[PDB]
Symmetry: D2
């Protein structure tokens, strides 16, 4: 008989049998970060279709942000990019009430954080190719694509540096974020869920420098042959009219995250 048994005060991910690590309440994710952060106004009714019962949509707004993380401690010095898509919500739990960003989808260009995000915290991470920013100052751009098929373009024209009070306001702000997810695991060979729970991951970045500017984005609808596992996600978000881009900032700094600060909410 097999000799593998999990240890009591350890944490794991599949494959568990190759071992894991001692639980530490003060486990950290540390990394350098750049973010291009946009908000756009859309149609409330249409966006509500994508927000689960239990949450209230606080504003007819979608938040879309490119982030690039470098010198990542838990990846022993590697890097990755992500596109975050969220909506501002209030959670009306039976135990917890709080405001945050309901995560719609996150694209990332590396699998390891995808697995971790989904399995540990119910963040709806999926893969895409995500260019680092192309820069002809004052212009910044990225492109996101699935197997050669473009589906999101972002552009930003920096118009000025944020300093003084306004930078304090910006900093103080970014420092605290309530990221909300939904960890769902399906039944095996049957409809429905084996596990289904909402999750809060408190995070924040320490902004060092910031610019304001003119932001834009564009979705390109995809066919199943183009993006078989994601076409309907893309096409759903593309259906949300971009009425106006209301916010656009480019920030540079670091993050120090208490990964064990995540918790189930209900």
């Amino acid at each position: 008989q097999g000799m593998f048994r999990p240890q009591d005060d350890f944490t794991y991910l599949m494959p568990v049998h190759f071992g894991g690590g001692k639980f530490d309440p003060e486990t950290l994710v540390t990394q350098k970060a750049t973010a291009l952060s946009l908000s756009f106004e859309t149609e409330r009714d249409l966006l509500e279709n994508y927000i689960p019962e239990g949450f209230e949509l606080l504003a007819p707004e979608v938040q879309v942000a490119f982030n690039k993380f470098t010198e990542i401690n838990w990846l022993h010095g590697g890097q990755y990019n992500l596109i975050n898509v969220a909506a501002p919500v209030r959670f009306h739990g039976k135990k917890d009430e709080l405001d945050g960003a309901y995560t719609l989808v996150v694209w990332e260009n590396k699998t390891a954080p995808i697995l971790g995000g989904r399995e540990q915290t119910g963040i709806p991470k999926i893969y895409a190719d995500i260019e680092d920013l192309h820069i002809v100052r004052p212009h910044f751009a990225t492109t996101v694509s699935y197997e050669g098929n473009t589906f999101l373009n972002m552009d930003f024209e920096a118009t000025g540096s944020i300093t003084g009070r306004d930078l304090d306001a910006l900093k103080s702000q970014f420092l605290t974020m309530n990221t909300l997810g939904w960890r769902y695991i399906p039944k095996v060979g049957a409809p429905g869920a084996e596990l289904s729970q909402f999750v809060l991951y408190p995070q924040g970045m320490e902004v060092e420098t910031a610019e304001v500017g003119k932001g834009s984005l564009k979705w390109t609808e995809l066919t199943p042959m183009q993006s078989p596992a994601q076409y309907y996600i893309v096409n759903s978000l593309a259906s949300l009219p971009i009425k106006r881009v209301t916010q656009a900032v480019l920030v540079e700094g670091r993050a120090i995250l208490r990964a064990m600060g995540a918790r189930v909410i209900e």
Copy 2:
């Protein structure tokens, strides 16, 4: 308030709020398939360290197979490569008693099947770049790497076609495989499991043609800087002595798999 609610007779993966598909007990995976399948003899006691209690290791053997899937239905005609690493076991359950292959690890070069396999069936799938076969007949080879760092080389020299009665035997062996996995989902912000169960995925392929030959493989140890999320997996594998490659075949065909036929075993 949000308008999204799951449908009763539907299956989902995160993000659930972008919808799913109606359950069909006869949901199929169909694809063309090439497999380069090796087995090697090793040390029993070392291999037993990675087999969960409840399983009995039936031989001191590791099975390692390159597979290439094309014309994949659920990926709307897409493709991907993998490396399957398993050992022969008997599950000694309180309810189920059966023999199959305990999946130690699977590398794939595409995220979609990695998420599905982990979340739907507990197959411990992770990411690596995997070369298509390089072919200078009778020599065939692949190389498996992580962010530029080689960790697995596989080589095969074809020495003969398998025909007639012996081809009939091989087809049989391949038609029915009991793939065994472990679906584990960690608690949020605490040690241990929220979900922990063993799973069976009955599968197998329809072999059309087969060649026998001389197989070899070589593991290359990785540092945490090279493969931060996987080094210990690679290195555990590397530590299992390759006393002799005992089996080496190269098969082509197709697969027709009953996806909803996977089941939890206990």
Copy 3:
């Protein structure tokens, strides 16, 4: 004690890590799949891209996806390409022949790109090229640069090509006069150090083939999206696609006499 080339030898940069003895019978041998389309466009517009010395035989652009495997000279490797050409007659001072003038070839691997350019003046450049995506009877590929789609190709197979039809198609493919222009710029000055037209007789042996309904679409790019190629893409995109005039999907192999390429004049 130093490096000197051998008289016997063929080289590519870097020459000093050595080369190989010339063989007039050096081959390229590979398995091959092709999705071959042609479309009718506007003569005047196309001629803008054809060098003086060539006559455009027809208002036609040939666009073909090829996938080469078990490639001998790549010791068993593979790559994909998109070939774009037009039918021409070369009115040389010595050479007089019909061929396919190469507008551009995208490849997804650098080695054939450097070889093609430097040995034979084939205008090879890089892009990401998907393998065929296949849900029969539908086939598709997407070509992109750093995440930016610029070509989509689609093909719906309507039937197998056989008998005399297959003989004809085999003939079409077996012998192809591929025409290039090998141009090397002067260093630190306008103009050319080397400028010559090249013929590379090649093709493929077709084994099996399907006919069907073909389509292609170009997506114009900006400089920030494809800084070295936007103007190529946008030129090709400017050629109206009036009619798709041939669409075939073929499988076989190729046996190419590499040293059969010659300068034409």
Copy 4:
């Protein structure tokens, strides 16, 4: 055929898709990070790869990782390279100068490979090259071909370079005589159509710099692993690493006079 080249334009294949007006002050501008090592080796072995006409000044191989970002001629794109060179003296019939004889450059984007080779005889070839992996004080990269590792570089920063040391460094990096060999083969015959040495005066403006402990490791490849390049890699691997003589990590920018390159003889 309506395409004709313009007199005072510069081109690269495909010429027929246009080019650019010559500008003697054409610039390459970019941000640059370089991890620059040198090692001592055996003179007699290194000399085998150095062409006649050049004298090997010291038995030294320079290996540097560079990352370029915000590049003008790539409209804000980026790429990585590994530069491998040896210090030489050119005993020309006309030109007499010292510089670095470029042995091979690996780059992870095809556009600069094409330009470098065809414009200046710099022996660029493709590899996958990781951006630096960083767990301070440790920095690393890995370089590979189709998944097959062939070069690992490591660096442990031990301090800042300041004052006089920094001025020395700035001066070392600012003015570099990069040397190449532009070679283009005969079509279908052995030998050269074009064979000339080339000087590209370049160099970067170092803002900040760290000193530390550097290492490197080559891994030999087989032809199935690396068909186009294995002999280059294996040649380099064969050069013993007797001592790492310099190791620095710098951070700055470059402003290069692209049109300042010239044939030397």
